[PDB]
Each structure stands twice: as C-alpha cells, then as structure tokens.
Amino acid sequence: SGFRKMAFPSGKVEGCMVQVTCGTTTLNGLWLDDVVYCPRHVICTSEDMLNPNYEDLLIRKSNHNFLVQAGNVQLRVIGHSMQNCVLKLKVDTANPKTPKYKFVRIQPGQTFSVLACYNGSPSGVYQCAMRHNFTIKGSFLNGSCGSVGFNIDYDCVSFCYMHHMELPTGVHAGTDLEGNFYGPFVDRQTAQAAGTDTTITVNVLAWLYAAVINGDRWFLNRFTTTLNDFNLVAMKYNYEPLTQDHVDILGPLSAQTGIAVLDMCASLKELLQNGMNGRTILGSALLEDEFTPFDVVRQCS
Amino acid sequence: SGFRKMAFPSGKVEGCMVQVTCGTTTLNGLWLDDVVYCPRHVICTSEDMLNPNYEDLLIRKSNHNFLVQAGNVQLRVIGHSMQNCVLKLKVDTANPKTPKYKFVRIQPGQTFSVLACYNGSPSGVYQCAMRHNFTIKGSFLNGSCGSVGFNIDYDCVSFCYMHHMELPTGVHAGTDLEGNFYGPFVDRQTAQAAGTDTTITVNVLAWLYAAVINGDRWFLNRFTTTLNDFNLVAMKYNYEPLTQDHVDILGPLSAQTGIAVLDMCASLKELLQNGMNGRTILGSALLEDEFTPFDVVRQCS
Numbered sequence: 238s239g240f241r242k243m244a245f246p247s248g249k250v251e252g253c254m255v256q257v258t259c260g261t262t263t264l265n266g267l268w269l270d271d272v273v274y275c276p277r278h279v280i281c282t283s284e285d286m287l288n289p290n291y292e293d294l295l296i297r298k299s300n301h302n303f304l305v306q307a308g309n310v311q312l313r314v315i316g317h318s319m320q321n322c323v324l325k326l327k328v329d330t331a332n333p334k335t336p337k338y339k340f341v342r343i344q345p346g347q348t349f350s351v352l353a354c355y356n357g358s359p360s361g362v363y364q365c366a367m368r369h370n371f372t373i374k375g376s377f378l379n380g381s382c383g384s385v386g387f388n389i390d391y392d393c394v395s396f397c398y399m400h401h402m403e404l405p406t407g408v409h410a411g412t413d414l415e416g417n418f419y420g421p422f423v424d425r426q427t428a429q430a431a432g433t434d435t436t437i438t439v440n441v442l443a444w445l446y447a448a449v450i451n452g453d454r455w456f457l458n459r460f461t462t463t464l465n466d467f468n469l470v471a472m473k474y475n476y477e478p479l480t481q482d483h484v485d486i487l488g489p490l491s492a493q494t495g496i497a498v499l500d501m502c503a504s505l506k507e508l509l510q511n512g513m514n515g516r517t518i519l520g521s522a523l524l525e526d527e528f529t530p531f532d533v534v535r536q537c538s
Numbered sequence: 539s540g541f542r543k544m545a546f547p548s549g550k551v552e553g554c555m556v557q558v559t560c561g562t563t564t565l566n567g568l569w570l571d572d573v574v575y576c577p578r579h580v581i582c583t584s585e586d587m588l589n590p591n592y593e594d595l596l597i598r599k600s601n602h603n604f605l606v607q608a609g610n611v612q613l614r615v616i617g618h619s620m621q622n623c624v625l626k627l628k629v630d631t632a633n634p635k636t637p638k639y640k641f642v643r644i645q646p647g648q649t650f651s652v653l654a655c656y657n658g659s660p661s662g663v664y665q666c667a668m669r670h671n672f673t674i675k676g677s678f679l680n681g682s683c684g685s686v687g688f689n690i691d692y693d694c695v696s697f698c699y700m701h702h703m704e705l706p707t708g709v710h711a712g713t714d715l716e717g718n719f720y721g722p723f724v725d726r727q728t729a730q731a732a733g734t735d736t737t738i739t740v741n742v743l744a745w746l747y748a749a750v751i752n753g754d755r756w757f758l759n760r761f762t763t764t765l766n767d768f769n770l771v772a773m774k775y776n777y778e779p780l781t782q783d784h785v786d787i788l789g790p791l792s793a794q795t796g797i798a799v800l801d802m803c804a805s806l807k808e809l810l811q812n813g814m815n816g817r818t819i820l821g822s823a824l825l826e827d828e829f830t831p832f833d834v835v836r837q838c839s
C-alpha cells in the first residue's frame with residue numbers, strides 16, 4: 238500500500254553523465270557509446286547568449302575547444318556536429334557504462350524521471366510530467382543545463398528530455414535528445430513565456446483509482462455521467478477533454494477496482510463542483526494530475 | 539527555481555541489491571563488502587511467520603539453506619549470523635560495487651530516500667520522512683521486504699532503514715541496518731498498530747521558507763509571535779513543539795530570506811487558524827512537513 242511520487246532508479250543514467258566546457262561556459266552532457274550530447278548553448282560566451290547565430294559560433298570552434306570530463310578523466314574530442322539544439326561531440330572512448338537506450342519524444346500528460354545534475358555530477362532524482370503547454374514544473378538551479386529526463390522499460394533507458402532553460406514563471410523548457418524543443422521555445426533570450434496550461438484529466442482519474450486501490454473511497458458516489466456531460470463540466474474548470482481513448486486506457490484500473498470510468502467521472506465532477514471540504518485524497522488536498530494510468534498500475538500492482 | 543519531492547541518485551545503492559531465498563521464502567538483501575544483510579524474517583516458513591522463535595529457526599539452518607542471487611550470479615554463502623532483526627550472510631565474494639558507506643540511525647522528522655526493490659531488482663526511488671510514531675508513509679507491495687532507505691553525503695551512502703512490514707493502516711515499519719526496529723514493532727504477527735502521529739513543525743517552517751525562496755509570498759504577514767505563544771496554538775493543531783534548537787537550525791533560511799523564524803511562525807499560526815482559502819503553496823493545498831531545513835537548503839541553493 239501507499240502512493241508516492243516515484244522516480245525510476247537513476248543508476249543507468251548516472252553512469253552517462255559528464256561535464257562539458259567550451260571556453261568558460263560549462264554544463265552537463267550525456268555520454269552514450271562514443272558520443273557526448275549536450276545543449277548547443279555551451280558554445281555561447283556571455284556576449285553571445287542573448288542573440289547567437291549558432292551555425293556561425295560552431296564553425297568558429299575546433300575539437301580542442303571542448304573539454305569533456307567524465308569524473309576525473311578527460312575525454313578526447315575527435316569530432317563535433319550540431320543537430321538542431323543539441324551538440325554532438327564524438328569522443329575517442331566508448332562509455333563502458335552505456336545502457337541499452339532509445340531517444341523517444343513524449344506527449345503532454347506523460348511523465349518521466351529527471352536526474353538533476355551539476356558540473357556533470359548527479360544531485361537528485363524526481364518525477365515530473367510534460368505539461369500541455371510543453372513546459373515542465375521542474376526543480377533546477379544554475380548549472381543544471383543538460384540534465385536529462387528519462388523512463389526505463391525493462392532494461393532500456395528511453396531518454397526523452399534534455400534541460401535547457403528556465404522561463405520567467407520559474408517553469409522549465411528543453412528539447413528531446415534530437416535537439417527539437419518541446420513547445421514554442423528557442424535557445425536564446427526572447428520575450429518567450431509559457432502558454433496557457435490545463436489539468437491532465439485522464440491522470441486525475443488514474444490517481445483517483447490509485448486512491449481507491451489504497452482504500453481512500455470517501456469521494457465515490459452512486460452516480461454515473463455521460464462523457465459529453467462530464468466534458469461540459471470539466472472544461473469550465475480548465476480540464477482537458479476526456480476522450481474514448483482515455484476511457485479505454487483507464488480500462489485496467491476500472492477492472493481492478495470495479496468502478497466504471499464514467500462512474501468515477503461523476504466523482505470528479507462532484508469534487509470540481511463542491512471542492513474537497515477539508516478532506517484529503519492520498520495525502521493531498523488537490524486533485525493530482527502528474528500520475529499516468531501506467532504509473533498507477535506500475536506502483537499499485 | 540521549482541521545488542520537488544527529490545530523492546538522492548540511487549545508483550550507488552542499486553549496485554548492492556541482491557535477492558535472498560531461504561526455502562520458498564524470498565526477499566531483498568543488501569550486499570556490502572563480503573556480507574549480505576537482509577531481514578531475518580526470510581528464515582520463516584509460512585507456518586512460522588505468525589509467532590516464530592528466530593533463535594530456534596536459525597540454529598536449524600545451514601549456509602546451503604540460503605540462496606543469494608546478484609543478478610544472474612549465485613553468491614556462495616560461507617557464514618551466517620543474526621544481529622537483532624537482521625540476518626548477516628557472509629559470502630565468498632566482496633561486492634566490487636560497494637560504495638563508501640555507513641550505518642546510521644535517523645530521528646523522527648528526518649528524511650531519506652527509499653529504493654523500492656522486488657526480487658533483488660530495483661523498481662523505483664522516492665523520498666520520505668521518519669514519522670513521530672516511527673512509521674514511514676512508504677509505497678511498498680508484496681516482495682519489497684529488505685528494501686533500504688538511505689541518504690548520500692558527498693560520496694558516502696548512509697544507510698538508515700531496511701523495510702520489514704506493512705501495518706494495518708497501510709504505513710510501514712522497519713529497522714536500522716543493525717536490526718533494531720524503529721518504534722515499538724516486532725517482526726511477527728501481533729496486534730501492533732501505529733501510535734499517534736504529529737506534524738513536523740520545523741519541516742513545515744522550512745518548506746514555507748522554500749516557498750518564499752521560490753516567490754510564493756501570499757501567506758506572509760507583518761506580525762511576529764513569541765515561541766511560547768506559537769507553541770500554544772500549534773499544539774492545538776497536533777503540531778510538534780517548536781524549540782530553540784529548531785529556531786537555530788532554521789537560521790540559514792531566515793538569513794537568505796530576511797524573514798525571522800518567529801515572523802514566519804506568525805504566518806504558520808494564521809494558516810493553521812484560517813486555513814489556506816483556496817490558494818496553494820509550492821503547488822500544495824496542505825502544509826507539507828516532509829522536507830527538512832537541510833533538504834530545502836540543498837534544493838534551493
């Protein structure tokens with residue numbers, strides 16, 4: 238029993254984290270096989286970071302301009318190239334700790350683990366979700382650039398996020414490992430700000446099922462709603478539309494608990510309309526939306 | 539910016555996790571140097587687990603009764619002994635991945651990371667606190683026995699918890715790595731239940747400082763209270779007494795924010811007396827008490 242914000246074990250990722258320095262600019266890199274991946278922002282000097290032309294900046298660099306440190310061992314850079322917003326530094330040594338891995342891009346509403354890293358040294362691990370506005374509500378300080386987000390499936394690390402920058406609201410923006418930003422952001426100083434966000438409805442329902450599995454039942458009721466009638470209410474509260482795809486994905490949790498999805502939607506409707514009235518669900522006084530149906534099934538069974 | 543339930547990177551602990559089987563009973567063990575540590579409950583058969591005499595059960599076992607598996611490698615057991623509620627199995631191979639480590643016992647209100655493990659295979663990592671009733675609000679399923687809790691200081695893993703059992707309320711009980719239970723619990727079937735718990739006041743204050751560091755200031759006020767007057771109010775709400783020791787520990791956060799501890803106590807008093815009125819602090823609608831002052835300083839600076 239119990240339900241926690243649970244991350245994947247981070248060891249397979251810790252073994253790939255390195256420090257990359259270009260000039261006086263330093264950040265974190267990801268060392269897989271004989272390649273180090275890092276944000277291309279590392280090639281900016283303080284005068285470049287505002288409005289850089291990255292193709293110009295990279296043409297002006299040599300392999301010897303990049304210092305890659307794996308612990309107390311320098312890795313010799315023998316090639317460099319840029320793929321969108323990530324730099325690829327070919328090194329003369331394959332990482333012996335390379336796990337089985339993939340580069341996958343995730344969807345808003347999906348979750349991943351973040352290994353926060355400073356000067357190539359891992360500091361902490363936490364769980365977060367990609368928001369509907371393609372930001373993440375992370376926890377990052379100066380020096381965290383290049384930290385990565387990932388999921389683990391069996392033995393395979395699926396890397397899905399590399400951290401670039403903090404937006405004015407304190408939320409975070411980054412790329413997939415192909416260098417393509419999540420959301421309408423660029424790796425330079427502009428007026429960019431996060432767009433409007435919504436509550437991830439299917440995740441809230443998954444978490445209500447987690448609560449029932451853990452014996453929190455006070456919010457259940459005898460009612461069932463239609464999908465259309467639920468969506469009419471949920472949108473008024475800035476909740477994402479619930480689809481038949483979402484209902485289908487919640488099927489296993491509905492089976493384990495014996496509560497149909499549209500029956501649980503009637504609980505959520507009442508919680509939205511009435512509040513929680515001084516009570517809690519799984520130790521929270523808010524409706525939590527950063528657990529996916531798969532996260533709940535993984536943790537509760 | 540940002541504030542998350544953040545665990546320590548778990549790789550140093552993953553490299554020590556093994557599976558221990560005695561008869562048909564299986565659980566997780568911790569392999570450090572040439573010793574495997576695990577709950578002594580592993581020597582119980584289904585008929586023994588209710589009311590065992592462990593000294594009797596261990597005298598009836600041989601080294602060959604213990605199967606220790608480190609991944610796909612069997613470790614040869616060459617000695618066995620029991621220290622309180624933990625079994626020590628001496629193996630013929632020192633773990634090459636042994637980190638620098640200590641066995642430390644923690645205090646109620648302190649936090650640690652948990653590496654949840656099943657069949658010797660790490661599954662997830664999360665953060666929790668030792669409660670005042672010496673339980674933890676963990677997330678554990680069948681097969682998690684022997685999972686460990688730890689903190690990391692520089693390069694040194696301080697192991698502080700090994701998981702034994704789930705109590706009827708769904709909270710969790712275990713030992714330090716010397717085999718000594720946290721709280722008045724025993725590794726057998728009795729009427730044992732968790733005693734009354736309290737809110738960890740110094741942690742709530744630390745988290746309010748975290749909120750201020752992150753720009754959440756709506757709960758601040760012009761007032762300051764005395765320590766005695768705060769404690770008179772906080773106890774009515776089942777909060778632990780605040781001591782001058784706690785005030786002193788909060789000094790660094792008070793300095794960074796420029797808010798005296800007794801000034802912040804006046805905010806907490808008002809939050810307790812008035813509620814939160816539909817607003818949130820660091821994304822929560824409750825006062826969070828599982829971040830220590832050290833956790834806040836580590837994460838916010």
Ligand SMILES: Cn1cnc(Cn2c(=O)nc(Nc3cc4cn(C)nc4cc3Cl)n(Cc3cc(F)c(F)cc3F)c2=O)n1
Pocket residue numbers: 261262263264276278279286377378379380381382401402403423424425426539
């Ligand atoms: C508070 N916070 C939360 N997340 C972050 C991530 N982050 C970062 O770690 N570093 C950044 N700028 C740098 C300054 C450097 C100074 N030296 C010596 N080396 C440095 C390296 C960097 Cl990367 N930034 C800012 C930033 C990073 C980008 F990748 C980008 F495209 C635009 C930006 F404004 C940063 O956000 N800090």
Ligand SMILES: Cn1cnc(Cn2c(=O)nc(Nc3cc4cn(C)nc4cc3Cl)n(Cc3cc(F)c(F)cc3F)c2=O)n1
Pocket residue numbers: 238562563564565577579580587678679680681682683702703704724725726727
């Ligand atoms: C739901 N939950 C949450 N935490 C836990 C931890 N936990 C556990 O993992 N296993 C336990 N009993 C076993 C049965 C076995 C069956 N086989 C084949 N092997 C087994 C090994 C164990 Cl350890 N228990 C119960 C339990 C474990 C103790 F160490 C103890 F002293 C008393 C107990 F009732 C358990 O709580 N499950």
